[PDB]
Amino acid sequence: WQARGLGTARLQLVEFSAFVEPPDAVDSYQRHLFVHISQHGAPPLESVDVRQIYDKFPEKKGGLRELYDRGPPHAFFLVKFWADLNWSGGFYGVSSQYESLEHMTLTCSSKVCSFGKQVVEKVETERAQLEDGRFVYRLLRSPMCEYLVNFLHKLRQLPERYMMNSVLENFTILQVVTNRDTQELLLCTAYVFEVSTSERGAQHHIYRLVR
């Protein structure tokens, strides 16, 4: 009954990535992945108690505690990213793909938070496209908001990766996917971050948020 990947029976994440294509990508295509989840016979995901990360996201409303209280509890995930920050006016982008058995319009809200305070927010809607019995939701090549692009440019220039990790310690992203018509929550993902080491590329670990 417990999740094996990032999804519920109503909405599965297929693929998520944040990337930059250098200006010369036009000559020889390349992209750098800052972070990447691909879910194209596994055990249960580990659990993390949601109370321990409340103070890393906003409060009062659209905050973790109120969202979790709203439910459903099984829709809540924590993703730890080891971001690859080793890669210039190129294209900074975010691509997301989801799948369901039912036809919905999704609202996807992404709240960028600094010391648990909302700083920027992007809200996108996506109508289902029916393909092979299953519905697919494609939010591909969304331009990264200027706050994140500038954050990444500054973060990458820090002299020590322990300082990157100290800065990232206070940097979080909260994603809420709801049925736009019914306002029911489909997927809530809390993102926390560290740097990887370049020889190592982007990595991640997914947890169920429990209470």
From Swiss-Prot:
Residues 1-211 are annotated as: Transcriptional activation. It is found in: Nucleus. Transcription factor which plays a key role in the Hippo signaling pathway, a pathway involved in organ size control and tumor suppression by restricting proliferation and promoting apoptosis. The core of this pathway is composed of a kinase cascade wherein MST1/MST2, in complex with its regulatory protein SAV1, phosphorylates and activates LATS1/2 in complex with its regulatory protein MOB1, which in turn phosphorylates and inactivates YAP1 oncoprotein and WWTR1/TAZ. Interacts with YAP1 and WWTR1/TAZ. This is Transcriptional enhancer factor TEF-4. It comes from Homo sapiens (Human). The lineage of its organism: Eukaryota, Metazoa, Chordata, Craniata, Vertebrata.
